[PDB]
Design a binder for this molecule. Structure first.
Ligand SMILES: Nc1cc(-c2ccc3ccn(Cc4ccccc4)c3c2)n[nH]1
Ligand SMILES: Nc1cc(-c2ccc3ccn(Cc4ccccc4)c3c2)n[nH]1
Lengths: 212, 199
Protein backbone atom coordinates (compact mmCIF):
# COMPACT_ATOMS: atom_id res chain seq x y z
CA UNK A 1 0.00 0.00 0.00
CA UNK A 2 1.77 3.12 -1.27
CA UNK A 3 0.76 6.74 -1.81
CA UNK A 4 2.83 8.80 -4.24
CA UNK A 5 2.31 12.55 -4.50
CA UNK A 6 4.17 14.39 -7.27
CA UNK A 7 4.52 18.18 -7.24
CA UNK A 8 5.34 19.93 -10.48
CA UNK A 9 4.64 22.98 -12.66
CA UNK A 10 3.98 20.53 -15.51
CA UNK A 11 1.36 18.13 -14.13
CA UNK A 12 0.61 16.79 -17.61
CA UNK A 13 4.12 15.28 -17.82
CA UNK A 14 3.10 12.66 -15.28
CA UNK A 15 0.02 11.53 -17.26
CA UNK A 16 1.76 8.32 -18.46
CA UNK A 17 2.24 7.21 -14.83
CA UNK A 18 -1.45 7.25 -13.92
CA UNK A 19 -2.06 5.57 -17.28
CA UNK A 20 0.36 2.69 -16.66
CA UNK A 21 -1.44 1.77 -13.40
CA UNK A 22 -3.69 -1.33 -13.61
CA UNK A 23 -7.18 -0.80 -12.21
CA UNK A 24 -6.92 -3.89 -10.00
CA UNK A 25 -4.02 -2.47 -7.97
CA UNK A 26 -5.82 0.85 -7.47
CA UNK A 27 -9.09 -0.92 -6.64
CA UNK A 28 -7.23 -3.14 -4.17
CA UNK A 29 -5.74 0.01 -2.60
CA UNK A 30 -2.17 -1.09 -3.30
CA UNK A 31 -1.17 2.20 -4.88
CA UNK A 32 -2.36 5.76 -5.37
CA UNK A 33 -0.48 8.30 -7.49
CA UNK A 34 -1.58 11.92 -7.30
CA UNK A 35 -0.14 14.81 -9.26
CA UNK A 36 -0.26 18.40 -8.02
CA UNK A 37 0.28 21.66 -9.89
CA UNK A 38 2.82 23.68 -7.87
CA UNK A 39 1.02 26.89 -8.86
CA UNK A 40 -1.82 25.97 -6.46
CA UNK A 41 0.47 27.30 -3.73
CA UNK A 42 1.63 30.55 -5.36
CA UNK A 43 0.99 33.83 -3.51
CA UNK A 44 0.55 36.38 -6.25
CA UNK A 45 -1.67 37.13 -9.20
CA UNK A 46 1.21 36.28 -11.59
CA UNK A 47 1.49 32.80 -10.02
CA UNK A 48 5.26 33.17 -9.64
CA UNK A 49 7.32 30.06 -8.89
CA UNK A 50 10.82 31.37 -9.62
CA UNK A 51 13.10 34.34 -8.88
CA UNK A 52 16.70 35.48 -9.48
CA UNK A 53 19.63 33.60 -7.83
CA UNK A 54 21.39 35.21 -4.87
CA UNK A 55 25.04 35.74 -5.73
CA UNK A 56 24.10 36.17 -9.36
CA UNK A 57 24.48 33.79 -12.25
CA UNK A 58 22.26 32.59 -15.10
CA UNK A 59 18.90 30.91 -14.82
CA UNK A 60 16.36 31.23 -12.05
CA UNK A 61 15.75 29.50 -8.71
CA UNK A 62 12.39 28.16 -7.53
CA UNK A 63 10.87 30.12 -4.63
CA UNK A 64 11.11 28.63 -1.14
CA UNK A 65 7.85 30.20 0.11
CA UNK A 66 5.79 28.46 -2.59
CA UNK A 67 7.47 25.07 -2.15
CA UNK A 68 7.27 25.40 1.63
CA UNK A 69 3.48 25.79 1.53
CA UNK A 70 3.03 22.88 -0.89
CA UNK A 71 5.16 20.47 1.13
CA UNK A 72 3.57 21.64 4.38
CA UNK A 73 0.20 20.61 2.96
CA UNK A 74 1.22 17.38 1.29
CA UNK A 75 3.88 15.91 3.56
CA UNK A 76 3.63 14.33 6.98
CA UNK A 77 6.34 13.18 9.38
CA UNK A 78 6.10 9.72 7.77
CA UNK A 79 6.79 11.03 4.26
CA UNK A 80 9.87 10.16 2.29
CA UNK A 81 10.53 13.36 0.32
CA UNK A 82 12.29 12.63 -2.97
CA UNK A 83 13.98 15.54 -4.71
CA UNK A 84 15.43 14.82 -8.14
CA UNK A 85 18.57 16.85 -8.88
CA UNK A 86 21.66 16.48 -11.05
CA UNK A 87 23.63 16.99 -7.82
CA UNK A 88 21.88 14.21 -5.93
CA UNK A 89 23.04 10.89 -4.52
CA UNK A 90 22.73 8.14 -7.18
CA UNK A 91 19.35 6.48 -7.47
CA UNK A 92 20.02 2.77 -8.01
CA UNK A 93 18.12 -0.51 -7.99
CA UNK A 94 19.04 -0.79 -4.32
CA UNK A 95 17.32 2.54 -3.72
CA UNK A 96 14.27 1.40 -5.65
CA UNK A 97 14.03 -1.73 -3.49
CA UNK A 98 14.30 0.35 -0.32
CA UNK A 99 11.65 2.84 -1.40
CA UNK A 100 9.26 0.14 -2.60
CA UNK A 101 8.07 -0.55 0.96
CA UNK A 102 7.44 3.11 1.85
CA UNK A 103 3.91 4.21 2.77
CA UNK A 104 4.24 7.69 1.31
CA UNK A 105 6.59 9.10 -1.30
CA UNK A 106 6.43 12.76 -2.23
CA UNK A 107 8.41 13.73 -5.31
CA UNK A 108 9.28 17.39 -5.63
CA UNK A 109 10.02 18.23 -9.27
CA UNK A 110 12.21 21.29 -9.86
CA UNK A 111 12.63 23.34 -13.02
CA UNK A 112 14.87 26.27 -14.01
CA UNK A 113 18.13 25.95 -12.01
CA UNK A 114 16.52 24.02 -9.17
CA UNK A 115 14.87 24.68 -5.81
CA UNK A 116 16.07 27.08 -3.09
CA UNK A 117 18.15 24.78 -0.85
CA UNK A 118 16.28 25.87 2.29
CA UNK A 119 13.22 23.93 1.15
CA UNK A 120 14.93 20.54 1.44
CA UNK A 121 16.92 21.64 4.49
CA UNK A 122 13.75 22.76 6.33
CA UNK A 123 11.90 19.59 5.31
CA UNK A 124 14.77 17.44 6.60
CA UNK A 125 14.21 18.77 10.12
CA UNK A 126 10.91 16.89 10.34
CA UNK A 127 10.95 14.16 7.68
CA UNK A 128 13.32 11.97 5.69
CA UNK A 129 14.59 13.78 2.58
CA UNK A 130 16.48 12.23 -0.35
CA UNK A 131 18.10 14.35 -3.08
CA UNK A 132 18.80 11.93 -5.93
CA UNK A 133 20.21 11.84 -9.45
CA UNK A 134 19.04 9.19 -11.94
CA UNK A 135 22.23 9.31 -14.04
CA UNK A 136 25.17 11.38 -15.22
CA UNK A 137 23.35 13.62 -17.67
CA UNK A 138 21.42 16.86 -17.26
CA UNK A 139 17.65 17.12 -17.75
CA UNK A 140 15.54 20.31 -17.94
CA UNK A 141 13.71 19.45 -14.72
CA UNK A 142 12.70 16.72 -12.32
CA UNK A 143 9.65 15.36 -14.17
CA UNK A 144 11.41 12.75 -16.36
CA UNK A 145 13.36 11.66 -13.27
CA UNK A 146 10.10 11.28 -11.36
CA UNK A 147 8.77 9.03 -14.15
CA UNK A 148 11.86 6.83 -13.94
CA UNK A 149 11.79 6.65 -10.14
CA UNK A 150 8.09 5.87 -10.04
CA UNK A 151 8.41 3.11 -12.61
CA UNK A 152 11.51 1.52 -11.05
CA UNK A 153 9.96 1.56 -7.58
CA UNK A 154 6.40 0.48 -8.38
CA UNK A 155 7.46 -2.48 -10.50
CA UNK A 156 8.97 -3.84 -7.27
CA UNK A 157 5.64 -3.53 -5.41
CA UNK A 158 3.90 -6.91 -5.76
CA UNK A 159 1.05 -6.81 -8.27
CA UNK A 160 1.13 -3.09 -8.97
CA UNK A 161 2.53 -2.93 -12.51
CA UNK A 162 26.50 -8.06 -10.48
CA UNK A 163 26.82 -8.70 -14.21
CA UNK A 164 24.87 -7.55 -17.26
CA UNK A 165 22.14 -9.66 -18.88
CA UNK A 166 23.26 -11.33 -22.10
CA UNK A 167 21.38 -11.49 -25.42
CA UNK A 168 17.88 -13.00 -25.68
CA UNK A 169 16.29 -14.78 -28.67
CA UNK A 170 12.87 -16.04 -29.73
CA UNK A 171 11.25 -17.41 -32.88
CA UNK A 172 12.00 -17.76 -35.69
CA UNK A 173 15.20 -19.86 -35.31
CA UNK A 174 16.59 -18.22 -38.44
CA UNK A 175 16.00 -14.60 -39.42
CA UNK A 176 17.74 -12.39 -42.00
CA UNK A 177 20.67 -14.80 -42.16
CA UNK A 178 21.13 -14.93 -38.39
CA UNK A 179 20.58 -18.18 -36.49
CA UNK A 180 19.67 -18.42 -32.84
CA UNK A 181 22.75 -19.85 -31.07
CA UNK A 182 22.38 -23.67 -31.38
CA UNK A 183 23.26 -24.19 -27.73
CA UNK A 184 19.91 -22.60 -26.78
CA UNK A 185 18.04 -25.33 -28.64
CA UNK A 186 20.26 -28.15 -27.33
CA UNK A 187 18.24 -29.31 -24.32
CA UNK A 188 21.46 -29.27 -22.30
CA UNK A 189 20.37 -26.86 -19.60
CA UNK A 190 23.63 -26.94 -17.64
CA UNK A 191 25.48 -25.98 -20.81
CA UNK A 192 22.93 -23.27 -21.64
CA UNK A 193 23.38 -21.75 -18.18
CA UNK A 194 27.15 -21.73 -18.63
CA UNK A 195 26.86 -20.21 -22.11
CA UNK A 196 24.60 -17.47 -20.73
CA UNK A 197 27.01 -16.84 -17.84
CA UNK A 198 29.89 -16.42 -20.29
CA UNK A 199 27.83 -14.09 -22.52
CA UNK A 200 27.11 -12.00 -19.44
CA UNK A 201 30.78 -11.85 -18.47
CA UNK A 202 31.83 -10.81 -21.99
CA UNK A 203 29.13 -8.13 -22.26
CA UNK A 204 30.04 -6.74 -18.85
CA UNK A 205 33.75 -6.59 -19.78
CA UNK A 206 32.94 -4.79 -23.03
CA UNK A 207 30.19 -2.41 -21.87
CA UNK A 208 30.59 -1.93 -18.13
CA UNK A 209 34.18 -2.66 -17.01
CA UNK A 210 33.36 -0.51 -13.97
CA UNK A 211 31.26 -3.38 -12.61
CA UNK A 212 34.34 -5.60 -12.54
CA UNK B 1 17.74 20.30 -37.58
CA UNK B 2 17.00 16.95 -35.93
CA UNK B 3 14.36 14.27 -36.51
CA UNK B 4 13.50 11.78 -33.77
CA UNK B 5 11.36 8.71 -34.34
CA UNK B 6 10.26 6.67 -31.33
CA UNK B 7 8.93 3.14 -31.84
CA UNK B 8 6.87 1.52 -29.07
CA UNK B 9 3.89 -0.68 -28.33
CA UNK B 10 2.75 2.09 -25.93
CA UNK B 11 2.64 5.31 -28.02
CA UNK B 12 0.52 7.09 -25.38
CA UNK B 13 3.38 6.99 -22.85
CA UNK B 14 5.44 9.21 -25.18
CA UNK B 15 3.00 12.15 -25.11
CA UNK B 16 5.02 14.21 -22.55
CA UNK B 17 6.99 15.36 -25.64
CA UNK B 18 10.77 23.84 -35.54
CA UNK B 19 14.46 22.94 -35.37
CA UNK B 20 13.43 19.46 -34.27
CA UNK B 21 10.57 17.11 -35.14
CA UNK B 22 9.58 14.16 -32.96
CA UNK B 23 7.34 11.34 -34.17
CA UNK B 24 5.97 8.38 -32.26
CA UNK B 25 5.13 5.11 -33.97
CA UNK B 26 3.02 2.19 -32.78
CA UNK B 27 5.05 -0.98 -33.39
CA UNK B 28 1.80 -2.94 -33.87
CA UNK B 29 1.21 -1.10 -37.16
CA UNK B 30 3.79 -3.49 -38.68
CA UNK B 31 2.27 -6.79 -37.48
CA UNK B 32 1.38 -10.49 -31.21
CA UNK B 33 4.82 -8.99 -30.84
CA UNK B 34 6.32 -11.37 -28.26
CA UNK B 35 7.16 -15.04 -27.68
CA UNK B 36 8.91 -17.30 -25.15
CA UNK B 37 12.74 -17.20 -24.96
CA UNK B 38 14.85 -19.82 -26.67
CA UNK B 39 16.84 -21.66 -24.03
CA UNK B 40 14.21 -21.03 -21.37
CA UNK B 41 13.65 -18.40 -18.72
CA UNK B 42 10.84 -16.24 -17.33
CA UNK B 43 8.99 -13.68 -19.41
CA UNK B 44 8.73 -13.04 -23.12
CA UNK B 45 10.99 -11.63 -25.82
CA UNK B 46 9.92 -9.29 -28.58
CA UNK B 47 9.97 -11.00 -31.98
CA UNK B 48 12.57 -9.71 -34.45
CA UNK B 49 10.20 -9.92 -37.42
CA UNK B 50 7.89 -7.04 -36.53
CA UNK B 51 10.84 -4.86 -35.48
CA UNK B 52 12.72 -5.55 -38.71
CA UNK B 53 9.81 -4.36 -40.82
CA UNK B 54 9.32 -1.22 -38.70
CA UNK B 55 12.97 -0.22 -38.76
CA UNK B 56 13.19 -1.03 -42.49
CA UNK B 57 10.58 1.66 -43.13
CA UNK B 58 11.81 4.22 -40.60
CA UNK B 59 15.62 4.01 -40.71
CA UNK B 60 18.19 4.97 -43.31
CA UNK B 61 21.92 4.25 -43.38
CA UNK B 62 22.41 7.69 -41.79
CA UNK B 63 20.15 6.84 -38.83
CA UNK B 64 21.53 6.50 -35.32
CA UNK B 65 19.50 3.65 -33.86
CA UNK B 66 19.14 3.99 -30.07
CA UNK B 67 18.04 0.96 -28.06
CA UNK B 68 17.48 1.47 -24.33
CA UNK B 69 18.35 -1.62 -22.27
CA UNK B 70 19.64 -2.31 -18.75
CA UNK B 71 22.58 -4.09 -20.40
CA UNK B 72 23.53 -1.07 -22.49
CA UNK B 73 26.65 1.10 -22.60
CA UNK B 74 26.11 4.06 -20.21
CA UNK B 75 24.26 7.06 -21.62
CA UNK B 76 26.07 10.07 -20.14
CA UNK B 77 26.27 13.84 -20.73
CA UNK B 78 29.09 13.12 -23.17
CA UNK B 79 26.70 10.85 -25.08
CA UNK B 80 24.07 13.59 -25.04
CA UNK B 81 26.56 16.06 -26.57
CA UNK B 82 27.58 13.50 -29.18
CA UNK B 83 24.01 12.80 -30.23
CA UNK B 84 22.98 16.47 -30.20
CA UNK B 85 24.45 17.00 -33.67
CA UNK B 86 22.78 13.96 -35.29
CA UNK B 87 20.32 14.36 -38.17
CA UNK B 88 18.17 11.36 -37.28
CA UNK B 89 17.68 9.44 -34.03
CA UNK B 90 15.42 6.42 -33.95
CA UNK B 91 14.66 5.09 -30.48
CA UNK B 92 13.45 1.50 -30.31
CA UNK B 93 11.57 0.97 -27.04
CA UNK B 94 11.34 -2.60 -25.85
CA UNK B 95 8.87 -4.14 -23.42
CA UNK B 96 8.51 -7.60 -21.81
CA UNK B 97 12.05 -8.97 -21.23
CA UNK B 98 13.49 -7.02 -24.14
CA UNK B 99 14.04 -7.38 -27.88
CA UNK B 100 15.52 -10.33 -29.82
CA UNK B 101 19.26 -9.53 -30.11
CA UNK B 102 19.16 -10.07 -33.86
CA UNK B 103 17.19 -6.85 -34.35
CA UNK B 104 20.14 -4.74 -33.24
CA UNK B 105 22.62 -7.07 -35.00
CA UNK B 106 20.74 -6.84 -38.31
CA UNK B 107 20.42 -3.07 -37.99
CA UNK B 108 24.14 -2.72 -37.37
CA UNK B 109 24.87 -4.10 -40.86
CA UNK B 110 23.10 -1.05 -42.32
CA UNK B 111 23.42 1.76 -39.75
CA UNK B 112 25.09 2.78 -36.49
CA UNK B 113 23.45 1.19 -33.44
CA UNK B 114 23.74 2.20 -29.80
CA UNK B 115 22.47 -0.04 -26.99
CA UNK B 116 22.37 2.21 -23.92
CA UNK B 117 21.50 2.22 -20.26
CA UNK B 118 20.28 5.40 -18.57
CA UNK B 119 21.20 4.18 -15.10
CA UNK B 120 21.63 1.17 -12.82
CA UNK B 121 17.98 0.50 -12.09
CA UNK B 122 15.40 -1.53 -14.00
CA UNK B 123 12.46 -0.07 -15.90
CA UNK B 124 9.47 -1.99 -17.28
CA UNK B 125 10.35 -0.86 -20.80
CA UNK B 126 12.22 1.60 -23.00
CA UNK B 127 9.66 4.41 -23.02
CA UNK B 128 10.75 6.28 -19.87
CA UNK B 129 14.37 5.94 -21.00
CA UNK B 130 13.41 7.41 -24.39
CA UNK B 131 11.87 10.41 -22.62
CA UNK B 132 15.07 10.91 -20.62
CA UNK B 133 17.32 10.60 -23.67
CA UNK B 134 15.19 12.96 -25.74
CA UNK B 135 15.20 15.61 -23.04
CA UNK B 136 18.93 15.37 -22.34
CA UNK B 137 19.78 15.54 -26.03
CA UNK B 138 17.35 18.24 -27.18
CA UNK B 139 18.39 20.79 -24.58
CA UNK B 140 21.85 20.70 -26.19
CA UNK B 141 20.72 21.10 -29.81
CA UNK B 142 22.29 24.19 -31.47
CA UNK B 143 19.57 26.71 -30.71
CA UNK B 144 32.75 17.23 -13.87
CA UNK B 145 31.66 18.48 -10.43
CA UNK B 146 28.24 18.65 -8.75
CA UNK B 147 26.16 21.82 -8.64
CA UNK B 148 26.18 23.48 -5.24
CA UNK B 149 23.12 24.89 -3.49
CA UNK B 150 21.11 27.82 -4.92
CA UNK B 151 19.00 30.46 -3.15
CA UNK B 152 16.56 33.25 -3.91
CA UNK B 153 14.38 35.75 -2.02
CA UNK B 154 13.64 36.26 0.87
CA UNK B 155 17.14 36.41 2.45
CA UNK B 156 15.67 34.99 5.67
CA UNK B 157 12.98 32.28 5.59
CA UNK B 158 11.63 30.26 8.53
CA UNK B 159 14.69 31.48 10.44
CA UNK B 160 16.99 30.06 7.75
CA UNK B 161 19.39 32.62 6.27
CA UNK B 162 20.87 32.73 2.79
CA UNK B 163 24.67 32.34 3.19
CA UNK B 164 25.83 35.94 3.80
CA UNK B 165 28.57 35.68 1.16
CA UNK B 166 25.89 35.47 -1.55
CA UNK B 167 24.46 38.80 -0.39
CA UNK B 168 27.91 40.44 -0.22
CA UNK B 169 28.24 41.11 -3.96
CA UNK B 170 31.90 40.05 -3.91
CA UNK B 171 32.26 37.92 -7.06
CA UNK B 172 35.61 36.39 -6.09
CA UNK B 173 34.38 35.44 -2.61
CA UNK B 174 31.11 34.14 -4.11
CA UNK B 175 32.91 32.17 -6.81
CA UNK B 176 35.19 30.70 -4.13
CA UNK B 177 32.36 29.76 -1.76
CA UNK B 178 30.43 28.10 -4.58
CA UNK B 179 33.54 26.16 -5.60
CA UNK B 180 33.98 24.96 -2.03
CA UNK B 181 30.30 23.97 -1.82
CA UNK B 182 30.49 22.04 -5.07
CA UNK B 183 33.68 20.21 -4.06
CA UNK B 184 32.18 19.38 -0.66
CA UNK B 185 28.98 18.11 -2.30
CA UNK B 186 30.89 16.04 -4.85
CA UNK B 187 33.02 14.37 -2.15
CA UNK B 188 29.93 13.53 -0.09
CA UNK B 189 27.55 12.40 -2.82
CA UNK B 190 29.65 11.39 -5.82
CA UNK B 191 33.18 10.60 -4.63
CA UNK B 192 33.70 8.59 -7.82
CA UNK B 193 33.68 11.83 -9.88
CA UNK B 194 36.89 12.88 -8.10
CA UNK B 195 38.46 9.44 -8.33
CA UNK B 196 37.58 8.05 -4.91
CA UNK B 197 35.95 4.80 -3.78
CA UNK B 198 32.16 4.58 -3.84
CA UNK B 199 30.30 4.06 -0.52
N1 LIG C 1 19.96 12.95 -13.08
C1 LIG C 1 19.42 14.24 -13.37
C2 LIG C 1 18.51 14.99 -12.59
C3 LIG C 1 18.27 16.12 -13.27
C4 LIG C 1 17.43 17.29 -12.84
C5 LIG C 1 16.53 17.19 -11.78
C6 LIG C 1 15.82 18.34 -11.35
C7 LIG C 1 16.02 19.59 -12.01
C8 LIG C 1 15.46 20.90 -11.84
C9 LIG C 1 16.04 21.75 -12.79
N2 LIG C 1 16.88 21.03 -13.50
C10 LIG C 1 17.67 21.57 -14.57
C11 LIG C 1 19.08 21.96 -14.06
C12 LIG C 1 20.13 22.15 -14.98
C13 LIG C 1 21.42 22.51 -14.51
C14 LIG C 1 21.64 22.68 -13.12
C15 LIG C 1 20.58 22.50 -12.20
C16 LIG C 1 19.30 22.14 -12.67
C17 LIG C 1 16.90 19.69 -13.05
C18 LIG C 1 17.63 18.52 -13.47
N3 LIG C 1 19.02 16.10 -14.37
N4 LIG C 1 19.71 14.96 -14.44
N1 LIG D 1 18.68 1.79 -17.80
C1 LIG D 1 17.53 0.98 -18.00
C2 LIG D 1 17.01 0.54 -19.23
C3 LIG D 1 15.92 -0.19 -18.94
C4 LIG D 1 15.05 -0.92 -19.92
C5 LIG D 1 15.02 -0.58 -21.27
C6 LIG D 1 14.21 -1.31 -22.17
C7 LIG D 1 13.44 -2.40 -21.68
C8 LIG D 1 12.53 -3.34 -22.29
C9 LIG D 1 12.07 -4.20 -21.28
N2 LIG D 1 12.63 -3.83 -20.15
C10 LIG D 1 12.43 -4.47 -18.88
C11 LIG D 1 13.54 -5.52 -18.63
C12 LIG D 1 13.71 -6.08 -17.34
C13 LIG D 1 14.72 -7.05 -17.12
C14 LIG D 1 15.56 -7.46 -18.18
C15 LIG D 1 15.39 -6.90 -19.47
C16 LIG D 1 14.38 -5.93 -19.69
C17 LIG D 1 13.47 -2.73 -20.36
C18 LIG D 1 14.30 -1.99 -19.43
N3 LIG D 1 15.78 -0.22 -17.63
N4 LIG D 1 16.75 0.48 -17.05
Amino acid sequence: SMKIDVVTIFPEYLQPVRQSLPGKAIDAGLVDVAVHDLRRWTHDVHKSVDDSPYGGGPGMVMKPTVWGDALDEICTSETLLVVPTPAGYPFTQETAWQWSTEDHLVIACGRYEGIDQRVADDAATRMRVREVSIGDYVLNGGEAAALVIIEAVLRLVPGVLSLLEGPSYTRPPSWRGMDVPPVLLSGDHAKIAAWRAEQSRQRTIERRPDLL
